[PDB]
Design a protein around this ligand. Structure first.
Ligand SMILES: *[C@@](O)(C(=O)Nc1c(C)[nH]c(/C=C2\C(=O)Nc3ccc(C(=O)N[C@H](C)c4ccc(F)cc4)cc32)c1C)c1ccco1
Length: 501
C-alpha cells in the first residue's frame, strides 16, 4: 500500500548533492559496513564484485549459521565449513586467515565442538576487511550510493509523511494511534504527546528522556523509535506496532490463569534479553509489570512503556520511589540509592506471576490495602507451589532476594549471570536472539486482544528519523531492493555520474 508516486518521493539525489555528507560522516568500518543495515548490504554488494573478496562474505555467512546450529549438528556443520573455505585447494579458499590459525581451528574439531569455534578466524577475517577492502569501498560507487541513502534518511519528517488510522491505546499525557508511512507502507504506533499537558506538568525533561532512551536503544525485545517529529498541539513518537496483546491479558483472560513453565520460560528469556540491551546503555526500566510486555504478530514480546526509564550515570546511583504498587523493589519502596537492581526484581515478579497466575505478594482472589502489599514485599518470603520446578523456584527466589546486593544479576557480571541459571538450562539464547525459536502462542491476524521559550525544547525532541530503524524500514518494504539499481553490466547509472546531472 505504498503511495502512487513513492519512487518520486524516495528518488535518489544526484551524487553532487551529498558532498557535505561525504565530509561529515565518520568512516567507521563497524558502522558503515555492519551496524547500519543499508551500509552493510552495500559493502557486501561491493565485495560480491571482486572474486577475491566474495569468498570472505560467504565464510562469515556460514559462521553465523554455525552459531545457531543445534548442538547435535554442530559437528556436521563445523566440517562443511572447514573442507570448503579453509582447505588450501578450494575455489572459495580464504588466504588472509593465517595458515597457523587454520591448523589451530582444525584441532578444536578433533576435540568436542563449541558454538564459538570459528570466532578466532571470523575476527581475523574482519581485520582484513577493516583495511584495504574497506578503503576501496569508500572510493567505490556503492559508497556513493550509500551517501544517497543517507541523504534521504536525513530528510525532514512532517505530518504529511505519515497517515494516522485508529486510536489504539490511551494514557496520561495523550493517546496512542496507528500510523503508516505513505511512501513505504510500513505500519507503526504513533504515540501523541499533547503539548498542552506537557507545558503545564512541566514534564519537558520527562518526555525528552523517554525519546532519547528510545532512539538510543536498538533491541529486538524493546519498542524501537523510528521517527520523532512535531505537529501542532502535540508531539509524536513513531514506535513499533504490537498487535498481539499484552502479557496481562494472556495470563488471566487466556491463561489458567497462568502458563506452563516452559511457556513462561520463553517469555522470560526474551524479557531478560530486552533488559540486557537496556543495561548496555546503563538505563534502568523500573516499570516491569505484565501489562507492559506486549506481543507482536509473530508471538514475540517487547518491553513497551519506557516513561519511567532513566539513564544512570556510570559510577553513580539514582533515587526515585516510582512504579506500580506491587511491582516496586524493596530498595525503591525505601527510597534508597539504587542502580539496575529494580529490574531483576521485576523479572522475578513476572516469572512467578506467569507460572503461578498471581502476584507473589497478593493473591488473585485477595483484597488487601497497598500498605499490606508493601509490608509483604519487605518482610515476608514468598511461597511456591508444584507448578514450579526446582530450577524455577531457584531463579524466582534469587531474583526476589530483598537485599539488592545478593540479588541475581546485580553483580558485575550482569545479565550473563542470569542466563546461565539452571532455569534456562534448555534455552539456547544464540538461537533466541536470532529469532529462530518458535513462540508458544501465535496471535491470529484478524484477532483483537484488547512561546519562544518552549521552542528550544521542541528543537532537541523533533530530531527526525532514527538511522537504523529507518534503513530497516527501507529494506522490509522492499524499497531498497527496488530502487538500489545501477547501470547495465556493472556501470555507473546517471544519478551517480557527475558528468551529466
Ligand atoms: C488492541 O486495541 C491493542 O492492543 N492496541 C495497541 C496496539 C496495536 N499497540 C498498542 C501499544 C503500544 C505499541 O504497539 N507499542 C507501544 C510502545 C509504548 C507504549 C506506551 O508506553 N503506552 C503508554 C501507556 C502511554 C503513555 C502516554 C500516552 F499518552 C499514551 C500511552 C504503548 C505501545 C496498543 C494499546 C488491538 C488492536 C488490534 C489488535 O489488538
Amino acid at each position: 500500500g505504498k503511495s502512487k508516486k513513492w519512487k518520486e518521493i524516495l528518488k535518489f539525489p544526484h551524487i553532487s548533492q551529498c558532498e557535505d555528507l561525504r565530509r561529515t560522516i565518520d568512516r567507521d568500518y563497524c558502522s558503515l559496513c555492519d551496524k547500519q543495515p543499508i551500509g552493510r548490504l552495500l559493502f557486501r554488494q561491493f565485495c560480491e564484485t571482486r572474486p577475491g573478496l566474495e569468498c570472505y562474505i560467504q565464510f562469515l555467512d556460514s559462521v553465523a549459521e554455525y552459531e545457531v546450529t543445534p548442538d547435535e549438528k554442530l559437528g556436521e556443520k563445523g566440517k562443511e565449513i572447514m573442507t570448503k573455505y579453509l582447505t588450501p585447494k578450494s575455489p572459495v579458499f580464504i588466504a588472509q586467515v593465517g595458515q597457523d590459525l587454520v591448523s589451530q581451528t582444525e584441532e578444536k574439531l578433533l576435540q568436542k565442538p563449541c558454538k564459538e569455534l570459528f570466532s578466532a578466524c571470523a575476527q581475523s577475517v574482519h581485520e582484513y576487511l577493516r583495511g584495504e577492502p574497506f578503503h576501496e569501498y569508500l572510493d567505490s560507487m556503492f559508497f556513493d550510493r550509500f551517501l544517497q541513502w543517507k541523504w534521504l534518511e536525513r530528510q525532514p519528517v512532517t505530518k504529511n509523511t505519515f497517515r494516522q488510522y485508529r486510536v489504539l491505546g490511551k494514557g496520561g499525557f495523550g493517546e496512542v494511534c496507528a500510523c503508516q508511512v505513505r511512501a513505504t507502507g510500513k505500519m507503526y504506533a504513533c504515540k501523541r504527546l499533547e503539548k498542552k499537558r506537557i507545558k503545564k506538568r512541566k514534564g519537558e525533561s520527562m518526555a525528552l528522556n523517554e525519546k532519547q532512551i528510545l532512539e538510543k536503544v536498538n533491541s529486538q525485545f524493546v519498542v524501537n523509535l523510528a521517527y520523532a517529529y512535531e505537529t501542532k498541539d502535540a508531539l509524536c513518537l513513531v514506535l513499533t506496532i504490537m498487535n498481539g496483546g499484552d502479557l496481562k491479558f494472556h495470563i488471566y483472560n487466556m491463561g489458567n490463569p497462568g502458563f506452563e513453565e516452559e511457556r513462561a520460560l520463553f517469555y522470560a528469556a526474551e524479557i531478560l534479553c530486552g533488559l540486557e540491551d537496556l543495561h548496555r546503555e546503563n538505563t534502568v526500566y523500573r516499570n516491569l509489570k505484565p501489562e507492559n510486555i506486549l506481543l507482536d504478530d509473530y508471538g514475540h514480546i517487547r518491553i513497551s512503556d519506557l516513561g519511567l526509564a532513566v539513564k544512570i550515570p556510570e559510577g553513580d546511583l539514582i533515587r526515585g520511589r516510582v512504579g506500580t504498587v506491587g511491582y516496586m523493589a524493596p530498595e525503591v519502596l525505601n527510597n534508597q540509592r539504587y542502580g539496575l537492581s529494580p529490574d531483576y526484581w521485576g523479572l522475578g515478579c513476572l516469572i512467578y506471576e506467569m507460572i503461578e497466575g498471581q502476584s507473589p505478594f497478593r493473591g488473585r482472589k485477595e483484597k488487601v490495602k497497598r500498605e499490606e502489599v508493601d509490608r509483604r514485599v519487605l518482610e515476608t518470603e514468598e511461597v511456591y507451589s508444584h507448578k514450579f520446578s526446582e530450577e524455577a523456584k531457584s531463579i524466582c527466589k534469587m531474583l526476589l532476594t530483598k537485599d539488592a546486593k545478593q540479588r541475581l544479576g546485580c553483580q558485575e557480571e550482569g545479565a550473563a549471570e542470569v542466563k546461565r541459571h539452571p532455569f534456562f538450562r534448555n534455552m539456547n539464547f544464540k538461537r533466541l536472539e536470532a529469532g529462530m525459536l518458535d513462540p508458544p502462542f501465535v496471535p491470529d491476524p484478524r484477532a483483537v486482544y484488547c512561546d519562544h521559550t518552549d521552542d528550544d525544547f521542541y528543537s532537541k525532541f523533533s530530531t527526525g528519523s532514527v538511522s537504523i530503524p529507518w534503513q530497516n524500514e527501507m529494506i522490509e518494504t522492499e524499497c531498497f531492493k527496488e530502487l538500489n539499481v545501477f547501470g547495465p553490466n556493472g556501470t555507473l547509472p546517471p544519478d551517480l555520474n557527475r558528468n551529466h546531472p
